[PDB]
Amino acid sequence: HSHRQSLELVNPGTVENLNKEVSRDVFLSQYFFTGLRADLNKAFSMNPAFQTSHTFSIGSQALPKYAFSALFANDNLFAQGNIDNDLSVSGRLNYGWDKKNISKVNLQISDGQPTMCQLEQDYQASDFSVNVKTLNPSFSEKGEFTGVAVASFLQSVTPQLALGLETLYSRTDGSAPGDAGVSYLTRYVSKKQDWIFSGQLQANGALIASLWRKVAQNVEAGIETTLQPTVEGSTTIGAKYEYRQSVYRGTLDSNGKVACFLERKVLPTLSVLFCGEIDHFKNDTKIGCGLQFETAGNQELLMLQQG
Amino acid sequence: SFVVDTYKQLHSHRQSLELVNPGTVENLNKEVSRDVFLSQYFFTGLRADLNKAFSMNPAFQTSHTFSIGSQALPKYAFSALFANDNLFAQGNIDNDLSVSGRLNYGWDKKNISKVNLQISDGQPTMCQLEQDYQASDFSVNVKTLNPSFSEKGEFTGVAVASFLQSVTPQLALGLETLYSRTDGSAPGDAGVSYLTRYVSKKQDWIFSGQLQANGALIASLWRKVAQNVEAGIETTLQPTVEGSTTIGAKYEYRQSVYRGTLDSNGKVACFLERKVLPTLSVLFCGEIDHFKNDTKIGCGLQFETAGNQELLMLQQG
Amino acid sequence: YKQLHSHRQSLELVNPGTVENLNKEVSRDVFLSQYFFTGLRADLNKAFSMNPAFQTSHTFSIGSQALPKYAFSALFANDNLFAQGNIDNDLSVSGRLNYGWDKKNISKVNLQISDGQPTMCQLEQDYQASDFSVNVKTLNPSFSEKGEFTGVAVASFLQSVTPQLALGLETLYSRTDGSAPGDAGVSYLTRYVSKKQDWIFSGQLQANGALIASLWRKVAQNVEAGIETTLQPTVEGSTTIGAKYEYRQSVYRGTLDSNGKVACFLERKVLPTLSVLFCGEIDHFKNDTKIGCGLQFETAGNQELLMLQQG
Amino acid sequence: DTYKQLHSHRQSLELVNPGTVENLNKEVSRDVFLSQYFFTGLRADLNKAFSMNPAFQTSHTFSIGSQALPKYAFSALFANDNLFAQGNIDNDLSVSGRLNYGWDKKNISKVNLQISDGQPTMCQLEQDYQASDFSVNVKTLNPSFSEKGEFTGVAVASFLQSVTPQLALGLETLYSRTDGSAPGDAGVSYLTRYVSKKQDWIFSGQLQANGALIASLWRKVAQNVEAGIETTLQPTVEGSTTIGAKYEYRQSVYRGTLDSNGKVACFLERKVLPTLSVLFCGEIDHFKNDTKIGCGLQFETAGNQELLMLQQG
Amino acid sequence: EKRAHQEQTEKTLKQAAYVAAFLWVSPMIWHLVKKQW
Amino acid sequence: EKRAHQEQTEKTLKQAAYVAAFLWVSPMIWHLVKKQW
Amino acid sequence: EKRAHQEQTEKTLKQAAYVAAFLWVSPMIWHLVKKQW
Amino acid sequence: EKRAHQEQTEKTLKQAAYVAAFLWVSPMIWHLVKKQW
Amino acid sequence: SFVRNAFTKSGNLAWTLTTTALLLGVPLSLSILAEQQLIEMEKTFDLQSD
Amino acid sequence: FGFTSSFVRNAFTKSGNLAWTLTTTALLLGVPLSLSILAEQQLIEMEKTFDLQSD
Amino acid sequence: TSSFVRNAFTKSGNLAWTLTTTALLLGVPLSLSILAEQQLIEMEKTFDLQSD
Amino acid sequence: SFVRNAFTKSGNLAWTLTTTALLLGVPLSLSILAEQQLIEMEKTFDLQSD
Amino acid sequence: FKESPLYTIALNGAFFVAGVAFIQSPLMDMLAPQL
Amino acid sequence: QAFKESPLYTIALNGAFFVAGVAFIQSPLMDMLAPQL
Amino acid sequence: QAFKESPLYTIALNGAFFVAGVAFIQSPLMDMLAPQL
Amino acid sequence: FKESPLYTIALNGAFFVAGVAFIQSPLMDMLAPQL
Amino acid sequence: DESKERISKILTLTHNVAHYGWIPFVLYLGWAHTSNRPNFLNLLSPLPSV
Amino acid sequence: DESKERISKILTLTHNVAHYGWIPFVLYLGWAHTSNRPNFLNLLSPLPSV
Amino acid sequence: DESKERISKILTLTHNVAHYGWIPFVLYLGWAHTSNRPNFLNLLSPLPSV
Amino acid sequence: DESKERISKILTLTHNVAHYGWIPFVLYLGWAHTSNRPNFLNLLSPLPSV
């Protein structure tokens, strides 16, 4: 037990933060859209962080016409509510029992679809991370579980590596026995925090191998390769060049498509954002434009926002 | 002899009126349709423009055009125009070989002759010959689309002759006449359309109304609020009866050109050309239709570069 | 609703005219279409009293189709009741009665018997408010065996949104027999009075596919002008521009039409009793002329008004 | 020995010259009645006089709503002491030209010419000689000679002799030959005129060669008022009786007519201006109950400055 | 047949000339009848 | 089929009554606008 | 049948020439009216 | 038939638990292998 | 009856005589009254002159 | 030349027709109005002569 | 008549959404252009005052 | 022919690489040039302050 | 009952005799105004 | 290709006549047609 | 009577929009839409 | 000529190895601006 | 029904009364509302004979 | 005969002269016999413009 | 059973409350946890009008 | 006829010349009317390489 403290192991990230650098920071798949969109958020307070966000959009299939979201964040509790046209309510709540242990509840109502709720418990130790999430828990008349349960673990075997696993147990109705799927997780951080390798072999036969690299303080790069008999895969290599006035993101895909995302902050309040995708195999173009106003609620944050 | 003396006396008698030369029939809606509105300028999808200037005393430049995502604009197009004091010649080559060539020639500053030629490689070649003469107080032009003579010695094609006379230094009334004969088996049909223009005394607002031969009417008003801002309205209407009303504003500056447009068809349009560099310029066009709730967006850019060293220094400073 | 009524008094609106008095200046004052005729006509009216207004009129006409040969009319008017009767050759009886319950609210009855045509009567109630005017008229009221209405019912409303404009509408519901359901048509009304009472715009969009747009203008105290444009897969329209120049001795009315026809009407008062009147129309598109002439004697019934008429 | 005593006492009878055959019913048919003056529909007359010692004036005529009067007609006439010449141009070019010439105050020669542009040109030559006690005229309508040397046309020769200073008896002879294949026919008509002693009333009767009879009486009541009756008749015999009166003044001329056919007629001319004059005419037919209304006006203006001042004052 | 009509018109013209001559005669006869009484 | 025409005419009458109520209400809203000027 | 259409189009061309001549004539007459003012 | 599938899934869960326990042990194993050389 | 025929006959004769008297009298009445006005104006111009 | 001659004759014909129509329209719209205005001027002149002789 | 009031809320919300997105589309590029032109004018004024 | 097919393939490849280089370069060039202008403005404000 | 041409001959003759007797009467002088 | 004397044509004709008449009446030329007295 | 609105509705609608836009442009409110600089 | 799932597996793997060789090279540092 | 026959009979009577005697009722109101109250011949004759 | 052709030709000539030039001959006599002798425009215009 | 009906009823009530009243509960927490505590209009209007 | 075949052949030749050689003729006019007269690579490339 004392020799485990002698190794001086470090806490790795979560399972959700395994591809945080490649999939979310560098690439644009979370951020890409289609058609015009406007964002209007206003800040009422900062020591509890509280803001309400309006979202207008037109010309896309995923983004709705009007969406009003508001979040509240003090030192240990987070609460995000999102109301939509045709009344699709999305609510997420984080609760901090500690800086390590947190419990979160996510809820989604689509008003015509079955209500989807998940309960997740996350415990971050000195050298491992555990989280157990459950999608739609329900018990049969026999006393048996029915739903989705994903339990995942990640241990640093050395201060550069992080090996772990995730387990998905899914039972739909109770007539048929639910199936189990085990997937493996591998992370390698370099010594000088320059480059990060990240691999996962999914239980569906899929494999995701990604690398992230930091050239300098303003420029970053990252590559991802995904593959799933009927086997196909995509290779995407991209970069993010960040500055004080704007953020550029470029992406070259093996599917014959290129992508660009420019967020140009022209004002301390206003910020323009542009995203463009060209597919060369069928020769078409998806263009999205949009804006973000951030405004204050009270007089003090109005003076703090400009200067 | 005596007829020339009577014609000179009549010319002096017309010079007593002190009339002004009205514009052409193509420049009748020049302020409303082309300056204020964006229908000539609106597009779809990304587009890049790359033109370089080789010389200026004869104006000469070659333009590359890349486009993707639209039905009107081709994928690649290369155009080049030449302009000395009296001749203007534009030649355009396209992918799949669609050749468009227009040539202006000024016999004088008033009288001009122009040729327009188009080959689409699978479509019939479309050519028009137009003669445009501007007098001191009227404007005449005659254009012929696809001239051809039958075996009987008869005309076969389209002939449009238009006349525009200023009755006073504010108004200008006129007409156009289209005679069209397709094949020769059926006799060609004739259509007369009327033309009306009113210019205000201080050149502030201009009314322009034309009643086409198809029953269609286009009534437009242009107004100039200040030196940098303009506005304009148009009503265009055609058992088929339908019409559209469009109001637009053009706010131009030294750094950019903004154009806004509100239609009676439930759609709005915006066109912003921001000149961010003396060479580079960014342009944006957006359209929202509310009656079916969709959006057309096209972004694009224009580089202008020099061909020689002297214009390379003249372009920056 | 007392605070709401005080708020309504805060606007200081004006009472607009009736729907019948919408085009009163263009169609009836300036133009001559109500006044034009054909052939010779003479009027002989005598006034018996003036504090109740009472007079009898004989009307002779020849050379026209609309005006009959002989027509005797008589009208009575005290402070709040108006009664007009008209007897005709071949016995066509026309009777109209206005009764004022107040200076604002009025009830009127119109009756027509043509001796071979179905008897046509209408009952109308007209109420003018401080700032709006409503009237409801019914042509040939009748109820079926089912208890359902059978006839014509027209209800119109006109509210001044401001002391210049007045917007409103009318609605006609017509049910002929009861076998087929009655149909309804809504027409719109717009009036714009200028600030100095100089010129009046008036546009109405009828439910039968017709539009009537008119303007009245007053150049001076003696002269007036006015234009009207009426239009109706069958569409046709006409534009008429006319002027009225009145004086103390005569009344002139000229009219130029888009139908290629011109019209003139001169009412020349030559005597304090006698008055000559002329009307002429030329159609250029088929090149013919309609000329009507006539005269009016107005005489007194009693001796006092006989001295009052001359001096 | 009738000839010498004839010359002596016929010189001693002191006979007066009667008027022409055209001036037989001038009082009843042209002066009092309105049938020459009546029209239908609107008409305007615009005549301007350039001179007076040679009488010369040009007249425009606008009319609409009638069948006889054309749309536009320009007429100009010239008259010195002995020659009268009238020209008339019309729309669709119907030319009418009349020329009088005075060989003396008694003897005159006149030509009438008419071209209708689609109808045969009609011309007549008339020689009119008024003697001391008789009046003769000979007119020929469309003179033409055949290949045999024979006349082809209309020849009207009329004679009028006063047997006494009140009566005037006469006759007219009309010989008409259309083509030459058929012999032309001759018709003799008689003429009777009786003037009263104080020039108050005139009787005038003619019996035409077609069996027609026209008997008229003119009477002058006072210096401003006149009256006259006419009776015309023509087996198929029919006739009309018309009584009429003309009340004239300096400002206005009134003419009224009652007919036996069931119609009445009125004709009023108002000289409201020294230049402008309004005129009105109305006819009511009672047997079929309709009305013909004609209105018109006359501007007379000057051509030169002297007659412009002479016209007003 | 036409000769009889021509002779009839000639007789009518000669009768008209005779009656016109008698009308020229008639002032003499009228005055001498007035002289007789 | 006549019930659809009767319903259409009744809808026209109710719509006319609604526009009449709107033209009663709207001048007071315009007076509120005029006080805002 | 086509001759009537040819005559109608020829009438349309001649009418266009007539109205063009009238539009050339009109400014002279209008300016001579304006000089009379 | 479904009992064998349930036993296979339970065996998969037990094998995953064994791999997780071995991963928790593996820092000691890796450090003692690195101490061996 | 015969009374209804005599009323119609008398009314038609009265209508014809009335419109005949109007048409033949009112232009004549206007002419004579205008001439009397001209005579009165000449008399007033003669008396003011003398 | 002959087609231009018929053109010029048709121009004379339309000119005469338009002059006729405008002339009869101007007469019908002017002459009763001229009589009315001139009678009104005469009545104003008579009132002025009666006013000056009274004062 | 609560369903009529809810239909009025739906119509008002839809009209407000359309006018809001129309005002944003017609206002934001114009606001960027005008503000850039104001910055260029202020830069020319600062270059003018430091030169003189 | 085969050589014309080679020119067509080369032109299509050139077109694709050209539009790809423009799309990946022009917003990046705008961002870098704006950041250079901001650095130059900070340097001019620093030199005028000192 | 005749309805002959002699009927309208006698009718026009009686109308002419009545008109002559009307004109030559002093009643026609009474229809003349004095001024 | 005219091919018709369309209803829209005479609609535009009546509208142009209305606009011309309103421009004629509101002009001071209509004041010039009114006499001073 | 009830009739089709289809020509007159769109024609009067486009005409009213044209008149309203002309009145909006000629107003000084359009000058208020112009910035001063 | 294979046209197998192993073909696109080897294609994606070669693209991944080429991208790793491009990133880890100093040419990726050359694509980064100095400022 | 009997009510239909009753309403038809009284509307027929009302129509006959309004046909024959409306304008004599208006003339009776006129003759009642005069201070002179003339006879029947002066009330119909258009002459000023009073 | 030939004299028939001669008389027909000169009657055709006389008909043409009397058709076209009768009323201009009358106007020529008028313009010759005036002391003012106006121009062509005043002789046809109905205006008093002298 | 009865416990199944009870748990179904309280889950239906929980679903209704979490549907209609989640984001107003979050906004109530926010409005309670501000020092300014604005009114209802400022909490929904996107303007900086404070 | 033979003239129809001649005009068809020369219009076919004119169409071929206008198709293949319009814009090289325009570029030759441009290259002739410049003082620098660049080569064939600079005349088509959009680069500022001069």
Ligand SMILES: CCCCCCCCCCCCCC(=O)OC[C@H](COP(=O)([O-])OCC[N+](C)(C)C)OC(=O)CCCCCCCCCCCCC
């Ligand atoms: C072959 C094909 C190639 C395709 C390539 C196409 C390239 C397209 C480029 C457009 C994206 C970049 C736009 C951008 O980078 O923006 C900023 C740009 C430059 O600004 P600056 O450096 O000069 O300012 C300096 C002020 N400073 C110093 C304080 C910061 O300015 C602007 O382009 C202003 C225009 C922005 C458009 C906004 C449209 C409205 C979108 C929202 C609509 C709302 C509907 C819901």
Ligand SMILES: CCCCCCCCCCCCCC(=O)OC[C@H](COP(=O)([O-])OCC[N+](C)(C)C)OC(=O)CCCCCCCCCCCCC
């Ligand atoms: C193509 C060219 C077309 C041109 C158009 C031509 C149109 C001309 C028609 C004008 C009609 C004349 C109008 C009129 O008013 O003229 C006025 C005139 C009186 O003038 P004054 O100077 O004496 O005024 C003196 C007045 N102050 C005493 C007070 C001072 O009067 C008269 O001309 C007498 C007219 C007689 C009318 C009476 C008709 C009676 C009908 C009976 C029918 C009975 C029905 C059954």
